Amino acid sequence: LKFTLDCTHPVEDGIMDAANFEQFLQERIKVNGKAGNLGGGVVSIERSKSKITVTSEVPFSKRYLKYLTKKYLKKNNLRDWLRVVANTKESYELRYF
Amino acid sequence: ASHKTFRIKRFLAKKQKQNRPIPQWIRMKTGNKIRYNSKRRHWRRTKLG
Amino acid sequence: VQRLTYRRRLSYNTASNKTRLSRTPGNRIVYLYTKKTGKSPKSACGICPGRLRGIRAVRPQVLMRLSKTKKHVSRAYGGSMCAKCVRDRIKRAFLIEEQKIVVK
Amino acid sequence: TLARRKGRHMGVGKRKGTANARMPEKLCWMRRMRILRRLLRRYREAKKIDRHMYHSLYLRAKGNV
Amino acid sequence: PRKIEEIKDFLLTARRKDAKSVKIKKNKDNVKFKVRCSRYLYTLVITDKEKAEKLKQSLPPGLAVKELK
RNA sequence: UGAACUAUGCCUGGGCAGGGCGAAGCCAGGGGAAACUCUGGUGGAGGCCCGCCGCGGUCCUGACGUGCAAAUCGGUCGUCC
RNA sequence: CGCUCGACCGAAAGGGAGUCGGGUCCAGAUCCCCGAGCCCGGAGCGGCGGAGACGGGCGCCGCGAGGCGCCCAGUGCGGUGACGCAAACGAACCCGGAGAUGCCGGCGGGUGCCCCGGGAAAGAGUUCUCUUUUCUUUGUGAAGGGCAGGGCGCCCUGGAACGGGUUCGCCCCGAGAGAGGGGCCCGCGCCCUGGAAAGCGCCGCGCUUCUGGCGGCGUCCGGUGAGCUCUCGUCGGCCCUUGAAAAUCCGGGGGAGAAGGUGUAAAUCUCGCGCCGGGCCGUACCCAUAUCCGCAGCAGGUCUCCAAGGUGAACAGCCUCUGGCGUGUUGGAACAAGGCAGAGUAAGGGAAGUCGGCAAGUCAGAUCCGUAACUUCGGGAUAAGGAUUGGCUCUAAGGGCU
RNA sequence: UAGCAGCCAGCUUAGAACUGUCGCGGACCAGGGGAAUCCGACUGUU
Ligand SMILES: [Mg+2]
Ligand SMILES: [Mg+2]
Ligand SMILES: [Mg+2]
Ligand SMILES: [Mg+2]
Ligand SMILES: [Mg+2]
Ligand SMILES: [Mg+2]
Ligand SMILES: [Mg+2]
Ligand SMILES: [Mg+2]
Ligand SMILES: [Mg+2]
Ligand SMILES: [Mg+2]
Ligand SMILES: [Mg+2]
Ligand SMILES: [Mg+2]
Ligand SMILES: [Mg+2]
Ligand SMILES: [Mg+2]
Ligand SMILES: [Mg+2]
Ligand SMILES: [Mg+2]
Ligand SMILES: [Mg+2]
Ligand SMILES: [Mg+2]
Ligand SMILES: [Mg+2]
Ligand SMILES: [Mg+2]
Ligand SMILES: [Mg+2]
Ligand SMILES: [Mg+2]
Ligand SMILES: [Mg+2]
Ligand SMILES: [Mg+2]
Ligand SMILES: [Mg+2]
Ligand SMILES: [Mg+2]
Ligand SMILES: [Mg+2]
Ligand SMILES: [Mg+2]
Ligand SMILES: [Mg+2]
Ligand SMILES: [Mg+2]
Ligand SMILES: [Mg+2]
Ligand SMILES: [Mg+2]
Ligand SMILES: [Mg+2]
Ligand SMILES: [Mg+2]
Ligand SMILES: [Mg+2]
Ligand SMILES: [Zn+2]
């Protein structure tokens, strides 16, 4: 239902920024087979200070966020610099190697 | 095989202890007269039956 | 898929080298040697083909450790004769002993 | 396999076994006979057909009718 | 292993002459008392929580207890 | 002195994909005045058929022929409840 | 007290009571360590508990709960029944059961494996474009208790033709079906004790021969299948083939005997538990294109178990994952003749080659059509002779459950 | 009451359109056939 993405370490070192990574999710989240408008108002994404929260009424498997997070790192040529790890439940942190 | 009798296992134990090389001090004791054991057997070349 | 092996020296599929697959607590599938299936007793009449009832079906020497009530029934010939052939032995014994009174 | 479910890759030139090997005729008869007799036993239970009409349709179904 | 269901029967088996030790396993939903005997390991599954301490102190003296955590 | 090879017999164990033709028995529907017939389905018989492992060893008179081998190798081939 | 008694040897695949889970080594392991059991043997006290043990009939003390005397019981009990209860005396002798029965075929129950669905969780892979994607991991021992499931010519009531029940096939019924209600057996399936503490998966911290340790979270929800094996049942088929013995164990018949006289005794098929013991021998490794045999690291020979994904009828052939390996007693550089092999290919002709169609060439799967002479009527027969076959988008028919 | 609604589940068969160079058991797997004569009946064995 409620999942978060903790990316405080990469934005503190000045590699990425939560402002661009948030906009990447709005255009690549597939809802009901489509990626536009997030299927309406069912899937709402909120962006805090270096912490993005995704909530929805459909199951919305959390490992889909890890699928798009790694898809975001490879797109920015830093796939070999960060490691998407689930520190706690309903969470996803980005750490170094 | 893995299933041995006590008599066969006792027979293989003696042939295993006879296959030891000649002690080094025996060579100096005999003045290199007995240099190597003339009854050394190999498990591939000589079979004991 | 794993290919498991035997656990004893006997490497043939004999009548006593029978196994079954069991899943261990270590998330493995190993062979587990089972005992041969027992047979319930038959009737002493030699007529009824079905086995006896109320009696365990185990190996012969297993019957040494079982209790007596697990090896017979509370009837007259229980454990050695079926109920249908007991009631026929009662009627046959009574009716034959009655014809031997009429002759006198 | 998802395409073979729609009939693709299963034409005449994609078969190398006898029709009785691809689908056993003895098992198609076993399926159908378990479907009809199960239907006849439900109509007799629900009193849609009596025991006299059930036995007639049972023998008629045992024959290829 | 045998499973005891009554609390009176557990204290009756825990006071045997062959009672080696009693192990207390605190699970998430219940708490088990595993008394070790000569042949079997009797286990009393107590689903209640406050009834566990009322039975932990009810154990006879001289029996070694081991709290498994 | 030998049946550790092989020949035959005995005791006790093990093993032999997938397919094909498809016999008795049975069900149903038609023909008959009876004798009894016809169609479909079912059934799964056999020192039966194609055929893998197995077990054999036809042909090439192939390879090899001081060989891998004091009898073997390849394709092909016989049989495989 | 003894006829079946004629010593004894003879199976590391026959018979044969009882051990499984986790961990550990440079090499050991169902044997060691930890945990959980089990079997056999042993007991005048065999150490306790329970069973055997249920009390009645006459008078009084008595307006009472109970207490006084005599006498008589009591080697268990329930169900119409199949049979069930923790036990529930019993010799000689007899009878029976299990040990202990072939091959083949059909079907059904259960595991294992495979497959499908979670737009499931934890890591990893791919991202130039697309991919809520791809890959890996998602667990429970023996023994006991309970319950699904399967089987039963097992019992009671009752009574059948308008015969009915029923299988893929059969088979079943007045010597009693169908239906209703029960009993027993097998349960290796599921829940629980074991048992999560452990085992795997992931994450974090401490540490670099005590260090080689401590913590966190997870170990999930379902589906079916002409799927493949194993196994337990069940119904058949075949034989001028009938498809082992014995140790050992049990039940019954039998009522010889033993037990005490009013609360116990004899006896207890542990009947709930406790106590002691289990000696001797084998145990490493190879098991075969280098640990066996063939003079050898010999292209030979040598008995078995386990066995995945795709194509396909297939345990065929070709490709891939787990696992294994360096091409099988050597490397490098050339591509002459002549060989062996690739069953290499070929203009026009098509057996003129040759002892001879030797050699290899055509044909080949499957579907739909069509198949003579002859015959022992079974066959011949895949006779012969034709057509169709990819890919893609649809349509139609064949099910289950409420 | 010439049965309907909801839900679930696979695997096969038949027909049709379109389409590529008339190619489609595309590799692999995989019977040449017919008319007669001699001998042995056949399977098996050496
Ligand atoms: Mg040798
Ligand atoms: Mg087998
Ligand atoms: Mg048929
Ligand atoms: Mg045999
Ligand atoms: Mg033929
Ligand atoms: Mg062959
Ligand atoms: Mg061969
Ligand atoms: Mg020969
Ligand atoms: Mg040859
Ligand atoms: Mg030659
Ligand atoms: Mg030469
Ligand atoms: Mg002997
Ligand atoms: Mg044996
Ligand atoms: Mg080892
Ligand atoms: Mg004992
Ligand atoms: Mg009493
Ligand atoms: Mg009493
Ligand atoms: Mg007493
Ligand atoms: Mg036997
Ligand atoms: Mg036998
Ligand atoms: Mg069978
Ligand atoms: Mg009945
Ligand atoms: Mg008796
Ligand atoms: Mg070993
Ligand atoms: Mg070599
Ligand atoms: Mg040349
Ligand atoms: Mg050539
Ligand atoms: Mg030419
Ligand atoms: Mg010429
Ligand atoms: Mg010529
Ligand atoms: Mg030829
Ligand atoms: Mg012909
Ligand atoms: Mg003639
Ligand atoms: Mg001639
Ligand atoms: Mg002949
Ligand atoms: Zn009888």
Experimental method: cryo-EM
Q: Are A50 and A7 in contact (CB under 8 A)?
A: yes
Residue A94: in which H helix or E strand, if any?
A: strand A93-95
Q: Are A91 and A52 in contact (CB under 8 A)?
A: no
Residue A77's region, left for phi above 0, alpha for psi from -120 to 50, else beta, is left
**Residue A19 token pair:** 């402002």
Rounded CA-CA distance A66/A82 in Å is 12
Rounded CA-CA distance A40/D17 in Å is 53
Q: What secondary structure letter does DSSP report for C41?
A: P
Rounded CA-CA distance D48/D40 in Å is 9
User: Which D residues between 42 and 61 have a beta carbon under 7 A from any strand H atom?
Assistant: 46, 48
Residue C29, C-beta contacts closer than 8 angstroms, at least 6 positions apart: C2, C4, C21, C22, C23
Residues engaging strand F (CB under 7 angstroms):
B 49; C 12-15; D 17-21, 24-26, 29-30, 59-60, 62-65
**Residue A23 token pair:** 């906009």
What are the CA-CA distances from residue D4 to residues D8, D24, E6 (Å)?
A: 5, 19, 61
Rounded CA-CA distance A52/A21 in Å is 9
**Residue B33 token pair:** 């007269």
Contacts 24+ apart (CB under 8 A), C70-77: C77/C44
> Residue E31: exposed, middle, or buried by beta-carbon count in 10 A (0-12, 13-18, 19+)?
buried
- Judge if the beta carbon of D10 is closer than 7 A to nucleic acid strand H: yes
> Residue A38: exposed, middle, or buried by beta-carbon count in 10 A (0-12, 13-18, 19+)?
buried
Residue C54, C-beta contacts closer than 8 angstroms, at least 6 positions apart: C72, C73, C78
In DSSP terms, A44 is beta-bridged to A55
**Residue B6 token pair:** 């006590």
Q: Are A97 and A10 in contact (CB under 8 A)?
A: no
Rounded CA-CA distance A55/A4 in Å is 9
Q: Which nucleotides of G are covered by protein (CB under 7 A)?
A: 12-23, 30, 35-41, 76-79, 81-89, 95-101, 106-108, 111-114, 116, 118-129, 131-133, 137-144, 152-155, 162-170, 183-189, 192-200, 202-204, 217, 226, 230-233, 247-253, 269-271, 273-275, 281-287, 291-293, 296-297, 303-308, 310-314, 365-368, 388-396, 398-401
Neighbours of C63 (CB within 10 A): 14
Give, in degrees to the nearest 5, the angle at Cα A63 between A26 and A18: 40
Rounded CA-CA distance A83/A70 in Å is 8
**Residue E25 token pair:** 């396993």
Residue C75: in which H helix or E strand, if any?
A: none
Rounded CA-CA distance A42/A39 in Å is 6
Strands annotated E in chain E = 3-4, 21-26, 31-36, 41-46, 64-68
Rounded CA-CA distance B2/B25 in Å is 37
Angle between helix axes A63-75 and A18-28 (nearest 10 degrees) is 120
Residue E1, C-beta contacts closer than 8 angstroms, at least 6 positions apart: E40, E41, E42, E43
In DSSP terms, A84 is beta-bridged to A94
**Residue D62 token pair:** 């045992």
Rounded CA-CA distance B31/C96 in Å is 109
Angle between helix axes D51-62 and D25-45 (nearest 10 degrees) is 170
Residue by residue, DSSP assigns A73-88 as HHHTT-TTT-EEE--S
